[PDB]
Amino acid sequence: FKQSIHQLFETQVERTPEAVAVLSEQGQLTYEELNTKANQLAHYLRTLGVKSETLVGVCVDRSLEMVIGLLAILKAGGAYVPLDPTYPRERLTYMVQDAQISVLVTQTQWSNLISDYQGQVICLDSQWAKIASYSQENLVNTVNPENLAYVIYTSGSTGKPKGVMIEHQSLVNFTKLAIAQYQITTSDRTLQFVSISFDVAAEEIYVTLCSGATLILRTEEMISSIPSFVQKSQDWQITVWSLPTAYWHLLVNELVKSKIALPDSLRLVIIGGERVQPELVRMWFKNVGNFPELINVYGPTEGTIAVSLCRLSQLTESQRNRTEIPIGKSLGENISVYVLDETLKTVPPETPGEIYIGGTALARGYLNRPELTAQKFIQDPFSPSERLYKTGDLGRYLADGNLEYLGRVDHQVKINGFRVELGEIETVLLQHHQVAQAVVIDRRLVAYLVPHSTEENLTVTLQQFLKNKLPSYMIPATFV
Numbered sequence: 001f002k003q004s005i006h007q008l009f010e011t012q013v014e015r016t017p018e019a020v021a022v023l024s025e026q027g028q029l030t031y032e033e034l035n036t037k038a039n040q041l042a043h044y045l046r047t048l049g050v051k052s053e054t055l056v057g058v059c060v061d062r063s064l065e066m067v068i069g070l071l072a073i074l075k076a077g078g079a080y081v082p083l084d085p086t087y088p089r090e091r092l093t094y095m096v097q098d099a100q101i102s103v104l105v106t107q108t109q110w111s112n113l114i115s116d117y118q119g120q121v122i123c124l125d126s127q128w129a130k131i132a133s134y135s136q137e138n139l140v141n142t143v144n145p146e147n148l149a150y151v152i153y154t155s156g157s158t159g160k161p162k163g164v165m166i167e168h169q170s171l172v173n174f175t176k177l178a179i180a181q182y183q184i185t186t187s188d189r190t191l192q193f194v195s196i197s198f199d200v201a202a203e204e205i206y207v208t209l210c211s212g213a214t215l216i217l218r219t220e221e222m223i224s225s226i227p228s229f230v231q232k233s234q235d236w237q238i239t240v241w242s243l244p245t246a247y248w249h250l251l252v253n254e255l256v257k258s259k260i261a262l263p264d265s266l267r268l269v270i271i272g273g274e275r276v277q278p279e280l281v282r283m284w285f286k287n288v289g290n291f292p293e294l295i296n297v298y299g300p301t302e303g304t305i306a307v308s309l310c311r312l313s314q315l316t317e318s319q320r321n322r323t324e325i326p327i328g329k330s331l332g333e334n335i336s337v338y339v340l341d342e343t344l345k346t347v348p349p350e351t352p353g354e355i356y357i358g359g360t361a362l363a364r365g366y367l368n369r370p371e372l373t374a375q376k377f378i379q380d381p382f383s384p385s386e387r388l389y390k391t392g393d394l395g396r397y398l399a400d401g402n403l404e405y406l407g408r409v410d411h412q413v414k415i416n417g418f419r420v421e422l423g424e425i426e427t428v429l430l431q432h433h434q435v436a437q438a439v440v441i442d443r444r445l446v447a448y449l450v451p452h453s454t455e456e457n458l459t460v461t462l463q464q465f466l467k468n469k470l471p472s473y474m475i476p477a478t479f480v
């Protein structure tokens with residue numbers, strides 16, 4: 001039953017070539033058009049040396065071009081590495097070097113973001129004539145399921161981010177299970193919300209495209225106000241929202257504060273990223289009710305997007321009335337979500353422990369971080385041919401079988417919905433000449449430091465220093 005993520009999409013293209021696949025404010029592509037265009041780019045990428053295990057940087061904005069690019073890389077046999085164009089030059093440059101990327105799929109407006117790069121560059125906005133000269137046919141046997149589909153960077157406590165390596169087989173497994181869990185059909189219209197820097201974008205994109213639904217790319221302007229967000233979702237007739245929990249929190253507050261009606265097309269809201277506030281869940285069910293369906297989805301990047309879900313709209317009133325809203329049960333049978341003690345033994349129900357993930361969900365590992373890999377991706381001592389990923393998440397199984405998230409064992413947090421290792425910021429701040437010791441903590445980010453030879457514009461100095469190294473959400477909003 002061997003399958004690549006793009007084969008899964010290709011099957012769907014055969015089924016419904018003329019359905020709309022992607023839609024943005026600026027235009028649209030049918031399944032056939034998306035496929036043939038990605039095929040053209042893929043064929044070109046092959047002539048540039050892209051083959052299985054080749055890492056291809058992708059530095060694009062959210063656009064039809066982005067989706068063509070991702071699929072092209074996949075069809076070519078390569079694995080993409082998202083290069084968020086809002087990140088500072090120094091970060092993107094580290095990632096390009098760390099990942100040894102020699103092909104970069106980008107656009108002309110981003111062309112000078114890499115401290116200059118000797119690899120091949122493809123600008124999709126300006127080189128389309130050249131790309132249109134390549135074959136429109138599907139490529140064959142470029143990749144196996146164990147080969148990489150993408151390497152996505154996440155925050156590193158030691159001072160630099162690191163790439164999580166995801167193989168097709170775990171991504172395909174996730175997409176299939178999620179299509180069936182959410183009942184995605186050809187009539188669905190899913191809003192693509194999160195940046196491809198975060199692996200929830202893969203869920204949005206591939207769940208939608210591998211089932212024949214229509215993927216609707218959001219604008220930047222539509223999220224800044226909830227009324228705009230809702231109204232736009234109504235204009236687009238969106239059926240599925242995938243929202244960071246922290247944005248969803250905003251949404252629930254604004255729904256009650258105002259008298260805003262959810263779009264009438266909306267049937268499913270998928271949330272995850274962090275602890276959902278039980279009070280806002282109560283507020284949801286009081287003001288909205290059980291439709292649209294609300295689902296809490298949990299997992300880390302290292303277990304391929306998500307491993308567990310809880311249908312919040314299906315919970316009893318008293319199940320919603322605990323200190324914590326459950327994250328639920330395994331997405332599927334080949335994904336194991338354990339709560340284990342410190343010798344990796346399961347515990348009786350209702351006893352807390354650390355969440356470990358096993359089975360088909362696992363990343364291959366971290367890219368070029370052998371110590372970190374060996375430490376987080378452990379050989380299962382009771383099932384020798386298998387691994388367990390150590391999440392750093394504390395949890396417990398309730399007697400009803402549902403999993404509870406109980407917090408972290410460490411200094412990883414969520415700021416604006418994004419994964420942040422506090423030690424990354426701290427490690428980086430320490431590198432500055434007039435910083436001697438530093439502690440950064442939540443809650444959102446406040447940096448506590450003892451200066452070396454302070455001026456009174458130290459705050460503004462460190463904000464510039466961090467501005468050119470870290471993503472904005474990692475920049476402490478106040479200093480002390």
Ligand SMILES: Nc1ncnc2c1ncn2[C@@H]1O[C@H](COP(=O)(O)OP(=O)(O)NP(=O)(O)O)[C@@H](O)[C@H]1O
Binds near residue numbers: 271420
């Ligand atoms: N539904 C949820 N409820 C509570 N916590 C959650 C939930 N989903 C994820 N988490 C937490 O978020 C972690 C995974 O975050 P992850 O998706 O890996 O980061 P990210 O938001 O994608 N940013 P990055 O990893 O830097 O690209 C888990 O280990 C949990 O700590």
Ligand SMILES: [Mg+2]
Binds near residue numbers: 200300302305306
């Ligand atoms: Mg994730």
